[PDB]
Design a protein around this ligand. Structure first.
Ligand SMILES: O=C(Nc1cnccc1CO)[C@@H]1CCOc2ccc(Cl)cc21
Ligand SMILES: O=C(Nc1cnccc1CO)[C@@H]1CCOc2ccc(Cl)cc21
Lengths: 304, 304
């Protein structure tokens, strides 16, 4: 009973957080096995961020210039290399708390938990979606760089995001764990356009199924629609077009509730065209798109 | 930049979760030092829950009937005692992962994180408020009993909630760590009235300050109000009456933003009387009350 914006338990990730300092800049690093991963802008001063030449800035740094600390644990740096927008600092000690892990590049519309950190210390955990325009609407202040996003499947942490930057608009941008930015962003202090964003249609439908399962069903109607007709409405309301692949991933929710995906689409169509009429769905007065069909199945069945 | 419903990092709590089995019932326990805490209804069968005589049911149980497990760790039970609605199982081994901790009884309107667990395994973490009627709107399924709520102040986990029951209405009830229920609830399968609930006024105002800090300011107006006038509006809209103690705890937010508390009350008054006019505040289309003034200060300053 009930449905919440739930994050993964952050324990396995807290054990990997370290503080990385280079010169006057301090940010967060991720210590997995004998490597510490952090945003490459740790080598910059505030002045360098206008148009940094990272290759040149990194050449002025030696292993002993990277100070890596995890509480009373001072790590000895024996190698450094830049891979895309991340620095990889080889340390002489493997992290005894390294969980089973993978590095994954998530798709837009997928969700993950963020463990927000400052000075290598965890401050909080929250669940979010990678927006269709490759930004995330997180909660990050100065010092949060290097905080990571992840998913967990039983004992395996799949790291998908490392925080790098706040855009002038207050939204966030970062990379996968190989240092490749999600979206068109560059690690420079320059105004950068984020694409037009859309609402994640498949996630809104998944959340409507979660609402029906938990008792909120006032939005169910006597109508149906087609993928074509629904997509004309989705275009009008800046929603992602629904594909048969999205219908297919909603199959378990459709099967559990007995509500055909196109019938749920007709409810979403009427909610888009008429609004919520001052009513709520799972404690929200807007259409929620930060729950994937898999999140709903996991939460509704109590997967640990 | 940004503002999220953030939970505490759950690492310190994950290390305390165990599975407790007695007969055919299995639920979650909390292992701190050499004691395991769990809901006393672990000693009941589904049939017993109608009107259980816990004193009699517990008399039929011996230390060897409580199976306590944490993965490949099987704990040896050397004592058992009931304290209010919790069972305390003394084990022969202190939990090596016991964090610095306290047991606290939170006040209604305060917030905390819940680490939802099944079979002793963490499934997710979410932030919530203790409602003014002493219920929580969580996300709990069968097997989640024994999952706990907590707050963290630097290295100290203050445990405030242990999950026991879902009311016929889909809301949740539980106890403090001494087994005293929050609210009028009893651990019986009987329909139980939860009081009339109200919206937590001080938290809504704190969240309006968080919105101003993060750039959402369309709701600021040219008006002011008095505690008396505001409270007539709060009564009409089923909001908790605002006191000088609530005004006092909003002082840091008032000081940071330069918006007098009564001026923010006038914005809240106009939002209550006119609605949000199809607009959002921090990604919400309703007035959010699950952030205390302390949560806003902590999040807005990046406390770890
Ligand atoms: O964005 C930044 N950080 C930041 C991150 N999350 C939240 C708040 C802040 C503090 O501004 C820094 C400072 C600004 O300039 C740039 C430019 C490029 C890159 Cl990669 C990083 C940065
Ligand atoms: O409420 C319960 N559990 C539960 C908890 N959270 C979410 C879902 C469920 C499963 O119903 C059990 C089963 C029902 O009867 C009672 C009566 C009293 C008490 Cl203390 C516990 C219970």
């Amino acid at each position: 009973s009930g449905f919440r914006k739930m994050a993964f338990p952050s324990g396995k990730v807290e054990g990997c957080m370290v503080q990385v300092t280079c010169g006057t800049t301090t940010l967060n690093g991720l210590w997995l096995d004998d490597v510490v991963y952090c945003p490459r802008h740790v080598i910059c001063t505030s002045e360098d961020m206008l148009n940094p030449n990272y290759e040149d800035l990194l050449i002025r740094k030696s292993n002993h210039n990277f100070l890596v600390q995890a509480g009373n644990v001072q790590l000895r740096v024996i190698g450094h290399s830049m891979q895309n927008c991340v620095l990889k600092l080889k340390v002489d000690t493997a992290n005894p708390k390294t969980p089973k892990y993978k590095f994954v590049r998530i798709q837009p519309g997928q969700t993950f938990s963020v463990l927000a950190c400052y000075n290598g210390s965890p401050s909080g955990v929250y669940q979010c979606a990678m927006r269709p325009n490759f930004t995330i609407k997180g909660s990050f202040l100065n010092g949060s760089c290097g905080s990571v996003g992840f998913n967990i499947d039983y004992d395996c942490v799949s790291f998908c995001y490392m925080h790098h930057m706040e855009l002038p608009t207050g939204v966030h941008a970062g990379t996968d764990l190989e240092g490749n930015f999600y979206g068109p962003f560059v690690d420079r202090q320059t105004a950068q356009a984020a694409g037009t964003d859309t609402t994640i249609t498949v996630n809104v439908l998944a959340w409507l199924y979660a609402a029906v399962i938990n008792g909120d069903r006032w939005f169910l109607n006597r109508f149906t629609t087609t993928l074509n007709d629904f997509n004309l409405v989705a275009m009008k309301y800046n929603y992602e077009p629904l594909t048969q692949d999205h219908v297919d991933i909603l199959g378990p929710l459709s099967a559990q509730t007995g509500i055909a995906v196109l019938d749920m689409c007709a409810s979403l169509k009427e909610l888009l065209q008429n609004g919520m009429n001052g009513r709520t769905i799972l404690g929200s007065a807007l259409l929620e798109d930060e729950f994937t069909p898999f999140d709903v199945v996991r939460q509704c069945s109590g997967v640990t």
